Amino acid sequence: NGGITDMLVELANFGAEAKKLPEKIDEFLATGKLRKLEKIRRDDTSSSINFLTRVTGIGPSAARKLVDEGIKTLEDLRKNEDKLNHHQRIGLKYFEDFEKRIPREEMLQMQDIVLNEVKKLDPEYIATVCGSFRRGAESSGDMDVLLTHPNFTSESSKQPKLLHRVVEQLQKVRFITDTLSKGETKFMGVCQLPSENEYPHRRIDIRLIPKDQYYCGVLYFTGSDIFNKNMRAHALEKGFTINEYTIRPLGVTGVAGEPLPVDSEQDIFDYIQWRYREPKDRSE
Ligand SMILES: Nc1ncnc2c1ncn2[C@H]1C[C@H](O)[C@@H](COP(=O)(O)OP(=O)(O)OP(=O)(O)O)O1
């Protein structure tokens, strides 16, 4: 029966009473589940792994041994402080708040303060929060401001202090509450707007780019993927390759190139002829 064909599909996942012995019931159709397999229970230990990654900083290597450190839960780690760095220390301490998307109300808010801070700093800067909020969206998960200055480019490749100047600052103001890393061309960290009678902290990463590699790197973080995936294409279609870093005329056999200069966003869109496909509509 259709009836006996189903418990069937359930076992494999997991003469008549002979191929049988070759246990079962309506017990398969019913479901044991995770418990039924309890292999599956060891499989859920894979729920350790990915859950464990959920914690900040910890990447492939990290959790695996950590969990391996007999460990697997919120609280394992909570005890297991010693077992990680300043990074991951945080993305635990916060992590929870970490799984709660912001409100573009606040965005604009920091959106302000950020660019508001820089502006206090110098005029030659230019910053821009990008990623999602840009696209219009009601909900991000990480701030992401992109900076640059004329006194800097892909040629100098040496000006940490620059990017450094503002990080210091955003902290000054008590905004950037903590800090994951730091390494000249990149900052990633934890902010938080201001009070008076408290909001959760949000992941930000300040980047910087030569005032040249700027733009391309710009289009790229506004994504999406697919979006930046549908585009790499067409340009290539029309024979052009692009990357996080830049626009390049192709080649005879694939390998070939050279960076065209790049004033604004729309200049590339010019390159592979397409319409200035505004952010909002930048989904695919
Ligand atoms: N820790 C992470 N590891 C890998 N990919 C991540 C991680 N966090 C986010 N992503 C990727 C996959 C998510 O679907 C996407 C969204 O990240 P998020 O920081 O939230 O950006 P975003 O919220 O503005 O967009 P969305 O979340 O929609 O994808 O980014």
Query: What is the CATH number for 234?
Result: 3.30.210.10
In a shared domain, residues 105 and 168: yes
How, if at all, do strands 178-179 and 145-148 pair? unpaired
CATH number, domain containing residue 183:
3.30.460.10
Q: Are 228 and 219 in contact (CB under 8 A)?
A: yes
Residue with tokens 């929870």: 96
* Tokens representing residue 148 in the block: 């640059």
User: What SS3 class is residue 107?
Assistant: helix
How, if at all, do strands 145-148 and 126-129 pair? antiparallel
188 bridge partner residues = 205
Any idea which residues carry the catalytic annotation?
Answer: 24
Ligand-binding site membership of 26 (annotated): no
* Tokens representing residue 102 in the block: 């912001």
Angle between helices 225-237 and 214-222 (to 10 degrees): 130
Distance (Å, whole) CA 66 – CA 163: 34
In a shared domain, residues 127 and 171: yes
In a shared domain, residues 77 and 147: no
In a shared domain, residues 120 and 198: yes
The single-letter DSSP state of residue 223 is -
Breaks (C-N over 2.5 A) in the chain follow: 14, 22, 197
- Give a three-class secondary structure readout of 128-188: EECHHHHHCCCCCCCCCEEEECCCCCCCCCCCCHHHHHHHHHHHHCCCCCEECCCCCCEEE
Distance (Å, whole) CA 146 – CA 205: 9
Detail the DSSP E strand segments found in the chain: 126-129, 145-148, 178-179, 186-190, 203-208, 240-241, 248-249
In a shared domain, residues 88 and 61: yes
In a shared domain, residues 123 and 201: yes
User: What SS3 class is residue 104?
Assistant: helix
* Tokens representing residue 282 in the block: 């930048």
CA dihedral 18, 23, 27, 28 (to 10 degrees): -80
* Mutate-to-test residue for ligand 1 from 142, 203, 228, highest number of ligand atoms within 8 A of CB: 142
Distance (Å, whole) CA 101 – CA 29: 39
Distance (Å, whole) CA 172 – CA 248: 40
Residue nearest ligand 1's atom 20 by CA? 141
In a shared domain, residues 219 and 245: no
In a shared domain, residues 110 and 215: yes
Task: Determine the straight-line distance between the first and last CA of the chain, rounded to whole angstroms.
Answer: 47
Task: Give the CA distances from residue 175 to residues 85, 170, 194, in Å, rounded to whole numbers and listed in that order.
Answer: 22, 5, 7
Of 99, 89, 86, nearest in space to 51 by CA: 99
Distance (Å, whole) CA 150 – CA 126: 9
In a shared domain, residues 95 and 114: no
In a shared domain, residues 151 and 87: no
Q: Are 241 and 250 in contact (CB under 8 A)?
A: yes
Distance (Å, whole) CA 266 – CA 219: 9
Chain CA centroid to CA 57, Å: 12
What's the alpha-carbon Rg for the chain, to the nearest Å? 26
The answer to whether the Cα torsion of 84, 81, 144, 230 is positive or negative is positive
CATH number, domain containing residue 89:
1.10.150.20
Q: Are 213 and 232 in contact (CB under 8 A)?
A: no
Ligand-binding site membership of 241 (annotated): no
In a shared domain, residues 55 and 136: no
Ligand 1 neighbourhood includes 141 CB (under 6 angstroms): yes
Which atom of ligand 1 lies nearest, measured to the CA of 142? 19
* Mutate-to-test residue for ligand 1 from 49, 132, 191, highest number of ligand atoms within 8 A of CB: 132
Residue with tokens 């990290």: 62
Q: Are 14 and 31 in contact (CB under 8 A)?
A: no
Distance (Å, whole) CA 190 – CA 209: 21
Phi and psi angles of residue 207, each rounded to the nearest 5 degrees, phi first: -120, 170
Ligand 1: distance of its center to the CA of 141 in Å? 7
* Tokens representing residue 228 in the block: 């930046």
Query: Which amino acid is located at 68 in the chain?
Result: D
Chain CA centroid to CA 252, Å: 35
Query: What resolution, expressed in A, was reported for this entry?
Result: 2.9
Of 125, 121, 129, nearest in space to 145 by CA: 129
**Helix (H) or strand (E) run with residue 110 in it:** helix 104-121
- Residue 148 belongs to what domain range? 101-224
Ligand 1: distance of its center to the CA of 135 in Å? 14
Residue with tokens 């995770």: 34
Distance (Å, whole) CA 193 – CA 177: 10
Residue nearest ligand 1's atom 9 by CA? 141
In a shared domain, residues 200 and 136: yes
